[PDB]
Amino acid sequence: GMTEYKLVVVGAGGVGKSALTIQLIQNHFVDEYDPTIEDSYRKQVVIDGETSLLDILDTAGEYSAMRDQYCRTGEGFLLVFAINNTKSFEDIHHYREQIKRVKDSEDVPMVLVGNKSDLPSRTVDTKQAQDLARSYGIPFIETSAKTRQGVDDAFYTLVREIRKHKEK
Ligand SMILES: Nc1nc2c(ncn2[C@@H]2O[C@H](COP(=O)(O)OP(=O)(O)O)[C@@H](O)[C@H]2O)c(=O)[nH]1
Ligand SMILES: *SCCCNC(=O)c1cnn(-c2ccc(OC)cc2)c1C(F)(F)F
Ligand SMILES: [Mg+2]
């Protein structure tokens, strides 16, 4: 059989939300994608042997109508920052707090994603990010949309978090 999952990719503009999404759906790094495009994209993958239809909202900086739909009904959220942009890391909590204010339950599947791991000019270190993730009770995954490192882990881990929540 199959299962469908509604995922929402959030975070500051310029962190690589579109690049991560396009790696997952098209299997390559697209380095120029209009920063203002906010849209949903469907992709079928196989996760732990199960056909999984992912319905992914890639959010822009600006806020489209779909955004409220997917905030309301979204089953899991990728909180994305870039490891070379401290401001994007500091923005994470605003997004997490808003998701929590919208939802009824406090147990909302989320993964913290630190993107652009290929760049040498790091300003947020993995210890800082793991400490934030631990304070939220969620996984931290380091990614490079450019090389694909960690990208599949980030999305598949989020699906696994959703599955755990659905079992309750
Ligand atoms: N080096 C590197 N550049 C990236 C990575 N992900 C995104 N970019 C670049 O970062 C900028 C913003 O990416 P984009 O996908 O448009 O971010 P969004 O605004 O979060 O959707 C673009 O210039 C991308 O080429 C990455 O993992 N590594
Ligand atoms: S699914 C819920 C998320 C959708 N996006 C927002 O709600 C949003 C848009 N802008 N912000 C935001 C950014 C920075 C800030 O302080 C510097 C406050 C708000 C958000 C929010 F973070 F609230 F989610
Ligand atoms: Mg984008």
UniProtKB/Swiss-Prot annotation:
Positions of post-translational N-acetylmethionine modification: M2
Compartments where found: Cell membrane; Endomembrane system; Cytoplasm, Cytosol
Residues recorded as bearing N6-acetyllysine in the entry: K103
Keyword Lipoprotein on entry: yes
Catalytic activity: GTP + H2O = GDP + phosphate + H(+)
Outcome, altering A145V: In OES; somatic mutation
Membrane topology qualifier: Lipid-anchor
Assembly notes: Interacts with PHLPP. Interacts (active GTP-bound form preferentially) with RGS14. Interacts (when farnesylated) with PDE6D; this promotes dissociation from the cell membrane. Interacts with SOS1. Interacts (when farnesylated) with GPR31. Interacts with RAP1GDS1. Interacts (active GTP-bound form) with both SHOC2 and PP1c (all isoforms) to form a tertiary complex; SHOC2 and PP1c preferably bind M-Ras/MRAS, but they also bind K-Ras/KRAS, N-Ras/NRAS and H-Ras/HRAS. Interacts (GTP-bound form) with MAPKAP1/SIN1; inhibiting K-Ras/KRAS activity.
Name used for this protein in its record: GTPase KRas
